Structure formats: structure tokens, C-alpha cells
């Protein structure tokens, strides 16, 4: 009913060896998602992959990525408090409203590439870019979730962990080849872009084997409602030879990307990922009004503690 300073409400998912429950912070009144995991039911490999996901989450703080707030660990349990996405998955949006206009699709795609480019700047590949992993906030703003298959990478070297959902997997992962990290995400962005503008998969079938033959063929239909600039973009990301796919920077400079009205917010956000490198006094005053010491709020913020002090500040800021 109440885990720490959070009051448990509806269950937003029950999967693998964990249960994600939507809960409210008792003091800040913020809407959060607490992934509850029993460390006494997981095999050693799965527990360590969960600990590695938390570290990767602590590195990825972006407006279009689900923000980790608090990590509460006991001797047998682990609770993972993260930002709650009100608008649900982008998959459930496409099922309910169909394909988006290239104006809506372009706006949401820019937010996805903004987070993917930021991942690859810190040398982190998501490796599971699905439309079910693209969550939406109250105003339908993209929020990349599920850094489950994500891992570090060295630019120029090849990865070998064959993971990723089949309808979005690149043909290298189907064949079981040592692939390049970012090109495997660029193929996933090719599938995601097509799903946003058509409301259907580029590659589909009755079974996984039918779908597998489809992805390996590289042939997909370009519809009448799809513009020439959009067709060129998708076609140059869904390429069988990875060495012939557009880079994350080429995707940003694509003619389709500059087709809307001038977007200075997008250019500023991708410029902050090539540069990488402010305490809200109104929040610190409210925390001191309650009783949360300023010295412990600052210590927990700089040491990446993700504790009661660190979480109350961040939740109060957002």
C-alpha cells in the first residue's frame, strides 16, 4: 500500500521478474512509476543487468528520456522510482488514432532523435527502440523508456549481444552478426519513422519466421500519402548494408527534417550533445520549510545519491 514515502495506486505493468506500479509521492504529490523487483527471485545474471540499467539511467538525464528519481534498496527488495508518462505508449496512440500527419510525425521524430543522439554522445546504445518503448507525457511529448537491452559501446568497434524486438530489429541481429551499435538504432529509427507516418510496420507477417524473411529482404511499400522527402529519409535508414545508412547527424540535416517551420529548439538540443559539459532557490526554500537540511540536499544532489533528499528536489522541480 505504501512503499517508503510513496502511496501505491494502479499497476501500469507486470512483466519479467518485476512489477511496475503507478504511485504518488506523499510529500511532493508527484505522479511516479515504481518498478518493484524481488532480488530473491532473480538469477544472478538478471540482477546484475538490473544494477547496470540503473547506472546507465543515472548517466541519461534528458527531456525526452524517462528520468530516474529514487532508488530504494532493502536486503531482499529493490524499488525504482521514475517519471510517469500520462499519454501511455506511442503504439497505443497509433492504434487509437491511426498514422500521424508528416507535421505531427516530424515533431515527435525530432524528439526521439534528440534523445537517441544524446544516448550515442555518452556512448550508450538503446538496442530496443520499439513504438511500445516510446512513452508520452501529458502534452504528447516523447519519453524514451526501457534501457533494458541498452549498453555501452566504443565508436568504430562491433557489439555482439543479440537483443532487440523482432519487428524493429536490424537484419544484422537476425543473421547473428557482430553489428555496429548506432547503425542498429538507426535501423530501428527507420522502422519507427514508417510506423508514425503509416500506422503499420514496414515489415510484418503471421509468424516471427515470416517477419524474419521480411526484414532480411529489405523490401517495404512506400505509400501515396508519404512525401518524397520522407520516402528518401526512410529509404536511407532502412538499408540492408549498415555501412550505407545515414549517420545520426545526417538524419538531422535531412531535407525532410528542415521541411516544417523553423525549429530552433531542436537545433539547440542536438548542439548540447556535441558540447555535453543552477539551484532553484524557490524549491530549496520549500524543502527548508518542511525541514530538509540545505547541506544534505546539496550533498545528495552532487554525489548522485537518488535518495529522499535528491528525489524531493527533482520531483519539486518538475
Amino acid at each position, epitope marked *: 500500500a505504501r512503499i517508503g514515502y510513496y502511496e501505491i495506486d494502479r499497476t501500469i505493468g507486470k512483466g519479467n521478474f518485476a512489477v511496475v506500479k503507478r504511485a504518488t509521492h506523499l510529500v511532493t504529490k508527484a505522479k511516479v512509476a515504481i518498478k518493484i523487483i524481488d532480488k530473491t527471485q532473480l538469477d544472478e545474471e538478471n540482477l546484475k543487468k538490473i544494477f547496470r540499467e540503473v547506472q546507465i539511467m543515472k548517466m541519461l538525464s534528458h527531456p525526452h528520456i524517462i528520468r530516474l528519481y529514487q532508488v530504494m534498496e532493502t536486503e531482499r527488495m529493490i524499488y525504482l522510482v521514475t517519471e510517469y508518462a500520462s499519454g501511455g505508449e506511442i*503504439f*497505443d496512440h*497509433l*492504434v*487509437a*488514432h*491511426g*498514422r500521424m500527419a508528416e507535421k505531427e510525425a516530424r515533431r515527435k521524430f525530432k524528439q526521439i532523435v534528440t534523445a537517441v543522439y544524446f544516448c550515442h554522445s555518452r556512448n550508450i546504445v538503446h538496442r530496443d527502440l520499439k*513504438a511500445e518503448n516510446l512513452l508520452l507525457d501529458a502534452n504528447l511529448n516523447i519519453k524514451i523508456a526501457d534501457f533494458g537491452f541498452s549498453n555501452l559501446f566504443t565508436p568504430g568497434q562491433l557489439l555482439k549481444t543479440w537483443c532487440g524486438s*523482432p*519487428p524493429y530489429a536490424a537484419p544484422e541481429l537476425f543473421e547473428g552478426k557482430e553489428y555496429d551499435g548506432p547503425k542498429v538504432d538507426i535501423w530501428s529509427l527507420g522502422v519507427v519513422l514508417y*510506423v508514425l507516418v*503509416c*500506422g*503499420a*510496420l514496414p*515489415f*510484418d*507477417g*503471421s*509468424t*516471427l519466421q*515470416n*517477419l524474419r524473411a*521480411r526484414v532480411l529482404s529489405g*523490401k517495404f*511499400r512506400i*505509400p*501515396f*500519402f508519404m512525401s518524397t522527402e520522407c520516402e528518401h529519409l526512410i529509404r536511407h535508414m532502412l538499408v540492408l548494408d549498415p555501412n550505407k545508412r545515414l549517420s545520426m547527424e545526417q538524419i538531422c540535416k535531412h531535407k525532410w527534417m528542415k521541411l516544417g517551420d523553423a525549429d530552433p529548439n531542436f537545433d539547440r538540443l542536438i548542439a548540447e550533445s556535441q558540447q555535453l559539459k543552477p539551484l532553484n532557490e524557490d524549491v530549496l526554500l520549500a524543502m527548508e520549510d518542511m525541514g530538509l537540511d540545505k547541506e544534505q540536499t546539496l550533498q545528495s544532489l552532487r554525489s548522485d545519491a537518488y535518495d529522499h533528499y535528491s528525489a524531493i528536489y527533482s520531483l519539486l522541480c518538475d
Partner: single-chain antibody
Amino acid sequence: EVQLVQSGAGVKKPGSSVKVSCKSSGGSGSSAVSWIRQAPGQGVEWMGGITSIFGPANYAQKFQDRLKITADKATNTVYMELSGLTFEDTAVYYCARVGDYNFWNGHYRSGYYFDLWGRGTLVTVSSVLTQPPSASGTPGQRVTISCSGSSSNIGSNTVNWYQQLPGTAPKLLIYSNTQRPSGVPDRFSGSKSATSASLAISGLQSEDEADYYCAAWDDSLNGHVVFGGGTKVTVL
């Protein structure tokens, strides 16, 4: 008691769009409803619908450009929108539910049989499987309807048979090649041999005067359910 309620008959002008709804009553969630249309005097053709767990929706190549299939899971409603209408889109639009949804993981190949059917919506716009066009027999005889496909559809998938009584929506008669749904008498038998399928109606009765269609999923491209041209069975 589970039935598929459809929206009313519409008269549309050229270039306009039409939206047809399909509300499920009696149970409750997870359906896999598809949209199939039937031109006046012509056979039935699959337009699009839920065909796998992977994507939000699947469309036949012919309808992808003008069809938008949506679903309000909060009200058990499934919608269909066809834009850029012409007199050739004047047809009886049906919504039909796939019968084996309850078994859909990633490896199970669906039979793609239409368990339930809607009454049909009359849409009027202001201006693949080889089957014999007709079959006849005297009461008591046995008639056999041939249905030929290719290795991409019948060769690699199950065959279904539908009976469409004059003026009604089609009804599932045979599923999974040989299976007779509850109510279908043992007089009707289905069979399949490599890329061919057959329907035998033994002890032919006056009540058997209907159009019969064979249907099998085709693995070409994103996949589609292909229907036969239909066989009108008359009794003498």
C-alpha cells in the same frame, strides 16, 4: 450472445471520406477485428485489420493509401475510415473477428478464420483464389467446390470456407481446413491437398442455396487474407 454492432448506411460524395464503427457487445476485451467489403454483385475482399501481435494494424496493398483502422479499447469499439471515395468504393462493409486470437503468441500461425461477423454497413458513393463461378445439384446429391491457390497462401496456410445466404453476411462454415464450427452439419466436409482445397456438400438440401467462399492467408509481403471469387450453389 457476443455480437458486432455496426454504424448506419451512408451516402457519400466523391472525394469525401466515410467512417464506419463496430462495437462489440457481450465480451470483453482483445478481439482482432478486420474490415472486409463486398461490391454489389461482386465477391468479398479483405481490406485490413489486426493480423499479428507486432504492429498496430495491417492493410492490404490496395487499401493502405485510403484506409485508417482505429480502435477505442475503452468502449470496445473498432473503427474504419476510407478517404478519397469514388463510385467503385460503393459496397457492403463488414467487420469480422479472427477466431483464434486467444492463441496468438509470435510462433503460432493463425488460421485467420472469421468467427463473428457484423450485419454490414451500406456505403454508397454518388457518381485471388481460383474457384468455379457456379455449382449445381439435385436434392440428395453431393457437390464439390474446388479452390486453388499458390504455395504462398494455401500451400503454407489453413483454408477456411464461408457460406453466404442471399442477403446475409458470410458465416464461417469450415475452419482449419476440415473443422466444422458448432451448428454446421456433418454433411459439409473440407479438405486440403498441397495448394488446393475442396468443400463437399453431401445430401444437398434446399437450405444449401447460397454463395460459398474459400479463404486462406497469403504470406506475400506484409501478408493478406485472400478470398475466392465465390461459387453460387443452386439446387434443382
